[PDB]
Design a protein around this ligand. Sequence first.
Ligand SMILES: CC(=O)N[C@@H]1[C@@H](O)[C@H](O[C@@H]2O[C@H](CO)[C@H](O)[C@H](O[C@]3(C(=O)O)C[C@H](O)[C@@H](NC(C)=O)[C@H]([C@H](O)[C@H](O)CO)O3)[C@H]2O)[C@@H](COS(=O)(=O)O)O[C@H]1O
Ligand SMILES: CC(=O)N[C@@H]1[C@@H](O)[C@H](O[C@@H]2O[C@H](CO)[C@H](O)[C@H](O[C@]3(C(=O)O)C[C@H](O)[C@@H](NC(C)=O)[C@H]([C@H](O)[C@H](O)CO)O3)[C@H]2O)[C@@H](COS(=O)(=O)O)O[C@H]1O
Ligand SMILES: CC(=O)N[C@@H]1[C@@H](O)[C@H](O[C@@H]2O[C@H](CO)[C@H](O)[C@H](O[C@]3(C(=O)O)C[C@H](O)[C@@H](NC(C)=O)[C@H]([C@H](O)[C@H](O)CO)O3)[C@H]2O)[C@@H](COS(=O)(=O)O)O[C@H]1O
Ligand SMILES: *[C@@H]1O[C@H](CO)[C@@H](O[C@@H]2O[C@H](CO)[C@@H](O[C@@H]3O[C@H](CO)[C@@H](O)[C@H](O)[C@@H]3O)[C@H](O)[C@H]2NC(C)=O)[C@H](O)[C@H]1NC(C)=O
Ligand SMILES: *[C@@H]1O[C@H](CO)[C@@H](O[C@@H]2O[C@H](CO)[C@@H](O[C@@H]3O[C@H](CO)[C@@H](O)[C@H](O)[C@@H]3O)[C@H](O)[C@H]2NC(C)=O)[C@H](O)[C@H]1NC(C)=O
Ligand SMILES: *[C@@H]1O[C@H](CO)[C@@H](O[C@@H]2O[C@H](CO)[C@@H](O[C@@H]3O[C@H](CO)[C@@H](O)[C@H](O)[C@@H]3O)[C@H](O)[C@H]2NC(C)=O)[C@H](O)[C@H]1NC(C)=O
Ligand SMILES: *[C@@H]1O[C@H](CO)[C@@H](O)[C@H](O)[C@H]1NC(C)=O
Ligand SMILES: *[C@@H]1O[C@H](CO)[C@@H](O)[C@H](O)[C@H]1NC(C)=O
Ligand SMILES: *[C@@H]1O[C@H](CO)[C@@H](O)[C@H](O)[C@H]1NC(C)=O
Ligand SMILES: *[C@@H]1O[C@H](CO)[C@@H](O)[C@H](O)[C@H]1NC(C)=O
Ligand SMILES: *[C@@H]1O[C@H](CO)[C@@H](O)[C@H](O)[C@H]1NC(C)=O
Ligand SMILES: *[C@@H]1O[C@H](CO)[C@@H](O)[C@H](O)[C@H]1NC(C)=O
Lengths: 318, 318, 318, 169, 169, 169
Amino acid sequence: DKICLGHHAVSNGTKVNTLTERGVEVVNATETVERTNIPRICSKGKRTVDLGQCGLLGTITGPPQCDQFLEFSADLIIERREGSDVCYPGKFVNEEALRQILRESGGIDKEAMGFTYSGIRTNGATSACRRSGSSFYAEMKWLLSNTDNAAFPQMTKSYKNTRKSPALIVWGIHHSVSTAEQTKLYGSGNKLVTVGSSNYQQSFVPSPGARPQVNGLSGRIDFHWLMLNPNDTVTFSFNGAFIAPDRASFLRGKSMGIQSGVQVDANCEGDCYHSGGTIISNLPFQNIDSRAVGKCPRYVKQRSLLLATGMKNVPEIP
Amino acid sequence: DKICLGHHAVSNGTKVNTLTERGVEVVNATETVERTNIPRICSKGKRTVDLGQCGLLGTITGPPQCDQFLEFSADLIIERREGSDVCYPGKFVNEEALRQILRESGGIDKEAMGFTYSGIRTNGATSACRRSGSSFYAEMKWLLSNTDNAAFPQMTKSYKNTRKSPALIVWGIHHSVSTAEQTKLYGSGNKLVTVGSSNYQQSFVPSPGARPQVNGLSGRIDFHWLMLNPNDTVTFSFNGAFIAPDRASFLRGKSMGIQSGVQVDANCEGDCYHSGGTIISNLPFQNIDSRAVGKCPRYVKQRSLLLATGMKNVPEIP
Amino acid sequence: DKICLGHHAVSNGTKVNTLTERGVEVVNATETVERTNIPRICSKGKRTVDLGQCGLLGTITGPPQCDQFLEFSADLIIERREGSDVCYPGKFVNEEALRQILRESGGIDKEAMGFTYSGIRTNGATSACRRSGSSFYAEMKWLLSNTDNAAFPQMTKSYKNTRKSPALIVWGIHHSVSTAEQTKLYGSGNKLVTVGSSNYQQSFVPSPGARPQVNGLSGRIDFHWLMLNPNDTVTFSFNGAFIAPDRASFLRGKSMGIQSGVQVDANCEGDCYHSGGTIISNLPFQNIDSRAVGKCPRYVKQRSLLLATGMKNVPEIP
Amino acid sequence: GAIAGFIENGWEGLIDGWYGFRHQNAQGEGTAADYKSTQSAIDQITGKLNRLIEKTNQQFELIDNEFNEVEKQIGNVINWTRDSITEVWSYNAELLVAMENQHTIDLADSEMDKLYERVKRQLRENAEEDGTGCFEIFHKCDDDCMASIRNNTYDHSKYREEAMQNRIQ
Amino acid sequence: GAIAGFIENGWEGLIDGWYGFRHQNAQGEGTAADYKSTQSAIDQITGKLNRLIEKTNQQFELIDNEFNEVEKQIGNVINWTRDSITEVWSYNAELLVAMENQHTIDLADSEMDKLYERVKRQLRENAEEDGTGCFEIFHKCDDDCMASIRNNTYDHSKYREEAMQNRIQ
Amino acid sequence: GAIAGFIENGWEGLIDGWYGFRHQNAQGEGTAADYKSTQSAIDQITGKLNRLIEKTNQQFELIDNEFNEVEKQIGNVINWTRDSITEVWSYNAELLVAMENQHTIDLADSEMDKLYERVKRQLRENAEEDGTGCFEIFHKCDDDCMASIRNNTYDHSKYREEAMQNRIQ
Ligand SMILES: CC(=O)N[C@@H]1[C@@H](O)[C@H](O[C@@H]2O[C@H](CO)[C@H](O)[C@H](O[C@]3(C(=O)O)C[C@H](O)[C@@H](NC(C)=O)[C@H]([C@H](O)[C@H](O)CO)O3)[C@H]2O)[C@@H](COS(=O)(=O)O)O[C@H]1O
Ligand SMILES: CC(=O)N[C@@H]1[C@@H](O)[C@H](O[C@@H]2O[C@H](CO)[C@H](O)[C@H](O[C@]3(C(=O)O)C[C@H](O)[C@@H](NC(C)=O)[C@H]([C@H](O)[C@H](O)CO)O3)[C@H]2O)[C@@H](COS(=O)(=O)O)O[C@H]1O
Ligand SMILES: CC(=O)N[C@@H]1[C@@H](O)[C@H](O[C@@H]2O[C@H](CO)[C@H](O)[C@H](O[C@]3(C(=O)O)C[C@H](O)[C@@H](NC(C)=O)[C@H]([C@H](O)[C@H](O)CO)O3)[C@H]2O)[C@@H](COS(=O)(=O)O)O[C@H]1O
Ligand SMILES: *[C@@H]1O[C@H](CO)[C@@H](O[C@@H]2O[C@H](CO)[C@@H](O[C@@H]3O[C@H](CO)[C@@H](O)[C@H](O)[C@@H]3O)[C@H](O)[C@H]2NC(C)=O)[C@H](O)[C@H]1NC(C)=O
Ligand SMILES: *[C@@H]1O[C@H](CO)[C@@H](O[C@@H]2O[C@H](CO)[C@@H](O[C@@H]3O[C@H](CO)[C@@H](O)[C@H](O)[C@@H]3O)[C@H](O)[C@H]2NC(C)=O)[C@H](O)[C@H]1NC(C)=O
Ligand SMILES: *[C@@H]1O[C@H](CO)[C@@H](O[C@@H]2O[C@H](CO)[C@@H](O[C@@H]3O[C@H](CO)[C@@H](O)[C@H](O)[C@@H]3O)[C@H](O)[C@H]2NC(C)=O)[C@H](O)[C@H]1NC(C)=O
Ligand SMILES: *[C@@H]1O[C@H](CO)[C@@H](O)[C@H](O)[C@H]1NC(C)=O
Ligand SMILES: *[C@@H]1O[C@H](CO)[C@@H](O)[C@H](O)[C@H]1NC(C)=O
Ligand SMILES: *[C@@H]1O[C@H](CO)[C@@H](O)[C@H](O)[C@H]1NC(C)=O
Ligand SMILES: *[C@@H]1O[C@H](CO)[C@@H](O)[C@H](O)[C@H]1NC(C)=O
Ligand SMILES: *[C@@H]1O[C@H](CO)[C@@H](O)[C@H](O)[C@H]1NC(C)=O
Ligand SMILES: *[C@@H]1O[C@H](CO)[C@@H](O)[C@H](O)[C@H]1NC(C)=O
C-alpha cells in the first residue's frame, strides 16, 4: 500500500526567465508588455475636437481653417499633420510653449479688447486668407496708414484683464517684402512696436526684405504672445507694421492634447494615446510608443516579458 | 512528556504588503516614508541670511531693500515671497540662471570698477528708490546728458578682472516712457550700447514707449549680466540709455539657497529644506515636498510604506 | 561506520553585502563596477578624425586650421581642447546645437551655392586668418563696398537645395570696432541683413563698438546657421556687414563625436568613450566618468560592488 | 506498474488541482487533488497579478512635437532624458519579472514540500519514504483509509501495532 | 489541557523572545525563549534597517522657482522630468518594501524550522513528532532534562533504552 | 578523530567540488565530491553572470560640453537630470547585488539540504543522523558500499536486517 504526493504538469510548457535560468519552463505564464494597439482615438466619455486643417495656434488668431474653433471647448484635443496655424505666411515666437498651454486649456473663451482707431485703415486683407473674397485673420486687425505711403500716426492702446483668469494676448509684426512695400503700407521712417505689462517687457522692429514665396507671398507675419495676470494691463505702443488683436482668450478648464493620424471613435473608452491609436491595457508595461501620453503603462524596450503564473513544469516519467 | 517549539505572537498586529499578499499581519513594523515636517528653517551650524524684502538679484544692483546685503556672506540663503530685486520697475534678462548662481555663491564681495565720467550727469535718481530722499540703485549709475535734451557723448569704458575668480558684471538699459523723455535724458537720435568681452558679445538699443505704471512709473530698466574670466576685460560702448555699474561682484565660496515662508530657527540642526520647513529624518523616503532641496530622502507618491520589523503574526489557538 | 555531507570552504574568504548582512564572507566573488580605464581612444574599425587645432564648427566656415577637414568623413570624431572654430574673433549663435548635429553627421560634403556679385569687393581678408599671407574663412566671402566709405548696394541672393538631404547654411554678421570702420567698409547709414526660408525667418543689424582685442582684433563676426529642407530656398537680403557663404554643407551619414585629451589607438577596439580614454568591459556598471558616451555600462557612485560567485564561507572546525 | 510522486516528474493526469494525492492499494490506483495546498499557491500567484495591475494615476502630456520638431538643443536634452528613463524602466521590468518568476517557482516548490511534510507527520511511525515522494504504508489501507489521509482524519494510533510489526520484520 | 507549537498558532505568552520552548512534564508546564534563534532573527532584521538608513551624500539644489515661475517650455520639461523621476522612486520604494517584507517573513519562518530541526536531531530516536510542532518524549523528562534540551546538553544515549522500549510497545 | 559535515563548518580539503561526501569505515577515511549538486549550483551562479553581461544596445551622445560650458540654466537642468539618474542607477546597482548575493547564498544552502535529504532517503531505516550533517550507518559499510551511496546504487533492502538489529539493541 502506497500514497504519493505530486504536482500537476503539462506538455504545453511555456518558457520564462528567472535570476538564474533563461528559458525555464513553467506550467502557465502571461504577458506583462502590451503590444496590442487599437488604431483609433477612443473618445467615449470625452468631449473631443478634431482640428483637422486648423492648426492649434490658429484657433487664437483665426485663419479661415479655424473659424469653427475660435471658441472651442474640449476634454480631448487632436492636432492633425495637415493642420496649419497660418493663412498669411508666418510663425509664432515660442510656439511650442503656447501649444502645450492650449492642449490642456479645455478650449478657449474669446472676449473683445475694445480697441478703437482713428486716421488709419483697419481693413488690411490678403488673397492668402480667402474667406468668400480676400480677407485676414478673424481675431486680428491689419492696420495701414490711410491712403498710400502716408505717415502712420503713433498710437497707444491698452487693455486690462478684469477677469479672474489670465488672458491670452496675441499680436503680430509684419515684415514686408521690401522697404518700398513697408513705406506704401505704413509710411517712411523706422517703425517700432513696444509691448508693456507689469511682469513683461519686449520690443519689436520690422525687417523688410525678400523671402521665398509661401502661399504666393514673400511677406511674413510673426506672432507674439503673453499671459496677462488678472487686473493687470497690457499696453501697445506702435507706429506701423503692427497686427493688432481684436479679442483676448481665456482658458476654459482642463484638457489633454494629442497628435494623431488615425480616425476617432466615440464608442471605445480609452485613456492612453499615441499618434497611431489607443492603448487599453491593465498591463504594467508597453512596447508600442515611448511618447504615448495620458495615463499609460510604462514604455519598455522589450517586446515580451513573460510572468510565470504557475509552477515549474516537470514532465512525467513515461 | 512533551516539548514544543514555538514563536511569539500578538493581538496588536500591524498590516504590511509583500509580493503576494496585501495586508498580511506581522508582529511589528516601522514606517519608511517621512511625513513629519518641522515648520521652521533649522539653521544651527549654518551662517544664515533672511533677505526678507530684498530680492536676491537686488543684492547685486542695490535697491534700498538690499542695503544690508550688498556684501553679504552665508552658508544658507533664504528668499522670501515679499522680496523684490527692483526699486525702479524692471527685470533681469536670464534672471533664474543668475539666481541659481547666487544661491550657491556663499555671498558676494564687491569691488569698485573705477569708471570716471566727463561732460555728463551721473546723479540720475528716482522717487521709486527712496533713500532718505529720491535716489537710485546703490551699485549703479544713472547717466544723463548734462542739461536737458543735450547730446550724450559717445563713451567707452573698460574693466579688467585682475582677480583669480570670475567677476559678476551687471548693467542696465533704460526704456523711457516716450521718445520725448528719452531725448530729454540722453538727447535725440538712435541710442546704442555695445558690451564686449573675450567670450561674450551682445548689443542693445532702447525701446521708448508707454507701459503700465509700476510703482507709479511707466519706464523700465532691464538688467543684463555676464561672468568675466580672470585677466579678461569687459568694454562698454554707449551713447545714452545706459545704466552703468560702479562695482563688480565676486563669489565668496559655497552656499545653498531656498525659498520659504516659515520662520528661522538656529537651535534645530537640519539639512533638507522646502518652502514649508525642514525634514529631519533617517528614513529613505518622504512624502512632504517633491521640490525639497539639500540632502534629502527621496520623494515618493505614497504617504505610507510599512516595513516589517518582525515575523508574520499568527494568533494563538484559544 | 559513518558518512557525512559537506561543502567546500576557504581561508581566502571575500566579503560581500546582502539584504541583511554587511561583510558576510563568501567563497568567491567578482566585481560588477568597472574602474579599469584605457587612457587611449581605441579606434580600430572606426574611421577616425582628430581635429586637433580645428574646432568642429570651423570645418563649416574654414579657418586655416580646418583646411584638411572642409569635407571630412568619419565614424568617430574627436574634438580637442586646443581646437578653435575661429580665426577672425567671433562665435556661433546656438553653437552647441550645431556641434551636436556635426558630431553625428558622419562628416560633411560641400557644394557651391553659386552667388555672383557686381559693384562690390569680395576679397575681404585679415591678418588673423593667415594663409601664406592675409586671408579669410575659406568657405565664406567678406563683402565690402568697392573703394572706401562708398555705398554698399542693396543685394538679394537666393539658393535652392536641389538635393534630398537638408543643407547646412552658415552666414556671418560683422561688427566693426567703430561706426567709422563700418562706414569705411560698407558705407554710411543703418545696415540690415534679412534671411528668409519657408520655415525660418530672422533678421540682423550690426553693432559697431570697441571690444577687447582678441587675436589683435577688436572686431567680431558672429555666425548664424540653419538647416534648409529639400527643394526649399534660402534668400539673403543685405546692404553691408554681411559675411556670405560660398558653399553649403550636407551631412554624409552617421558618426559619434567625443572630446578627449589622450592619444588615439587604431589597434584597440572600443565602443565607450570619455575624455580620459576608453572603457572596455562586460560589467554592468562603471565608476570612471558619468558623462561617458557611446555604448556604456551605467555609471554609479560606488567604486565597488562585489557579486558573490560562490556559497557562504564557513571555516572548518580545527 | 509502480507509482511515483514529485522528485523527478509531475503528473499530467492531475487536471483538477496543482497538488494532489496518488495511491495504490488492493482497490487499485487513484489520484485526487489537495484543495488547501492548491488554493494557497493560487491565492499567492493571483496576489502578484493584482499588485502588478495597480494602475498609476500619473498623467503625462506632450513635451515635444512630431509634426513641427522642437529646437535642436532642447530636443536633444528631451530625447536624452526619455531614453535614459526608458533604460531605467526596461531594467526595472526585466528585473521585476525575473525576480517574481524565481519567487513564484520557489513558493510553488515550498507548497509541495509542506504537503509532503504534513502527510509524513500524519503517518507517524506507520510508513516509510520510498525516495520518489511516496510513502510505503506498512498496514492495509483501503480507499476509506486513503481518503482519511487526504482530509487529515487519519489516526495513526489505530494502525500503529500492525504497522510497527510489518516494519520491524 | 494540551500544548501545541508552531503550525497553526504562535504564543502570545512568549514575551521574552521571538522563538522558544514549551514543555509539559510531571513538574507541570513551562515556557522559555531560545536565545540563539531569537538573536539571529533580530540581527538580520536590524541589519536591513541599517542598510536602509545609509544616507545619500548627493545634494540637490533648486532648478525652478515657486515665486517667479520659470519659462513655460523649460518649466514643462523640468516638471516632466521630476514627475518621471518621482514615478521611478515611488516604484522602487513600493517594490523594495514588498520585497524586504517577503524576505523578512520567510527568514523568520526559516529560523523556526531550523530550531525545530535542531531539537529533532537532539532527541534522536527518543521522541516522535505530534504534528503540531511538538515532540512526544518517550521517557521521563523532568525540568532538568527539559533544560538540557534547551541548552543542547541532552545526551540521547542516556535515555535511549527506556525510550525505544516505550516506543516499540 | 571524529568527522563532521555541514552544520558548523565547511571542508577546506574538498577542492574538487562544492558539495561532497566524507566517510569513515574500517578502510579509513575518505572525501569525494558530488557532481550533480555541484554542477546545479555552478550552472545557477554562471546563469546569473550571463544575465548581468547582457549588454545594452542604447547609445548615448554628448549633451553638454566640457571645453565650452553650455548656458547656465540648461546646464543646471542637465546636471540635475544626470545626477538624478546616477542616484537611480547607484540605488539599482546596490540593491541588485545585495539581492542576488542573498539569493546566491540561499540557493547554495538549498543544494546542501537537498543533498543531505537525498542521502537520508537512500539510507532509509539503516542509519541515524548524528546532528553534525552526518549519518551513523548501523551496518558494515566498506568502500564499495560507501561508493554505492555516492552514485545512488545503494539498496537499503540488502542491509536492513543487520541495521535494524544494531539499531534496536
Ligand atoms: C508668382 C506670380 O506669378 N505672381 C505673384 C503674385 O501672386 C503676387 O501678386 C501680388 O503682388 C502685389 C504686389 O507685388 C501684392 O503684394 C499682392 O498681395 C496682396 C494680396 O493679394 O494678398 C494684395 C493685398 O491687397 C495687400 N493687402 C494689404 C493690406 O497691403 C497685401 C500686400 O500687398 C502684401 O501681401 C504684403 O506683403 O497682399 C499680390 O497678390 C506677388 C506676391 O506679392 S509679394 O511678393 O509676396 O509681396 O508676386 C507675384 O510674383
Ligand atoms: C498717476 C499720477 O497721478 N501721477 C503720476 C506721477 O506719479 C508721475 O509724475 C512724475 O512725472 C515726471 C514726468 O512725467 C517724471 O517722470 C517723474 O519721475 C521721476 C521720479 O520722480 O522718479 C523724476 C526724476 O527726477 C527723473 N530722474 C531722471 C534721472 O530723469 C525720473 C524720470 O523722469 C522718469 O522716472 C524716467 O522714466 O523719475 C514722475 O514722478 C508720472 C510718472 O512718470 S512716468 O510716466 O512713469 O515717466 O505719472 C503721473 O501720472
Ligand atoms: C595693439 C597694437 O600695438 N596694434 C594693433 C594692430 O594689431 C591693429 O592694426 C591694424 O589696424 C587697422 C585699423 O586700426 C586694421 O583694423 C587692421 O586690421 C585688418 C587686418 O590686418 O586684419 C586690416 C585688413 O586689411 C582689414 N580687412 C578688411 C576687409 O577691412 C581688416 C579690418 O581693418 C578690421 O579687421 C575690421 O575689424 O583687418 C589691423 O591689423 C589694430 C587692430 O584693429 S582693430 O582695432 O581690431 O580694428 O590695433 C592696433 O592697436
Ligand atoms: C494561465 O494564466 C492566465 C493568466 O492568469 C489565466 O488566464 C486568466 O483566467 C482568469 C480566470 O479564468 C481571468 O480572470 C478574469 O478576470 C476578469 C476581470 O476581472 C473577469 O471579467 C473574467 O471573467 C475572469 O474572471 C484572467 O483575466 C485570465 N488572464 C488572462 C491573461 O487571460 C489562465 O487561466 C491560466 N491557465 C490555466 C490553465 O490555469
Ligand atoms: C517595533 O519596531 C520598531 C522599529 O525597529 C522598534 O523600535 C526601535 O527600538 C530600538 C531600540 O528600542 C531603537 O533603537 C534606538 O536607536 C537610537 C539611535 O541609535 C538610540 O538613540 C536609542 O536609544 C535606541 O537604541 C529604534 O530607533 C526604534 N525604532 C523606532 C522607529 O522607534 C520596536 O522596538 C519594535 N517593537 C518591539 C515590541 O520589538
Ligand atoms: C571566482 O569567480 C570568478 C568570476 O566568475 C571566476 O573567474 C572566472 O573563470 C571562468 C573560467 O575559469 C572565466 O570564464 C572565461 O570566459 C571567457 C569568455 O568566454 C573565456 O575566454 C575564458 O577562457 C574563460 O572560459 C571567467 O571569465 C572568470 N571571471 C573572471 C572575472 O575572471 C573564478 O574561477 C572563481 N574562482 C574559483 C576558485 O572558482
Ligand atoms: C486693480 O488695478 C488698479 C489699477 O488698475 C489698482 O489700483 C488695484 O490695486 C488693482 N487691484 C484691485 C483688487 O483692485
Ligand atoms: C593678462 O592680460 C594681458 C593683456 O591684458 C595679456 O597680455 C596676458 O597674456 C594675460 N595673462 C597674464 C597671465 O598676464
Ligand atoms: C520644388 O520647388 C518648386 C518651386 O521652387 C515647387 O513648385 C515644387 O512644388 C517643389 N517640389 C517639387 C517636388 O518639385
Ligand atoms: C528625438 O527623437 C526622435 C525619435 O528618435 C527624433 O525623430 C528627433 O529628431 C529627436 N530630436 C532631435 C532634436 O534630434
Ligand atoms: C510645474 O509644476 C508646478 C507644480 O505642479 C506648477 O505649479 C507649475 O505651473 C509647473 N510649471 C509649468 C511651467 O507649468
Ligand atoms: C555641470 O556639472 C559639471 C561637473 O560637476 C560642472 O563642471 C558644470 O559647471 C555644471 N554645469 C553648470 C551649468 O553649472
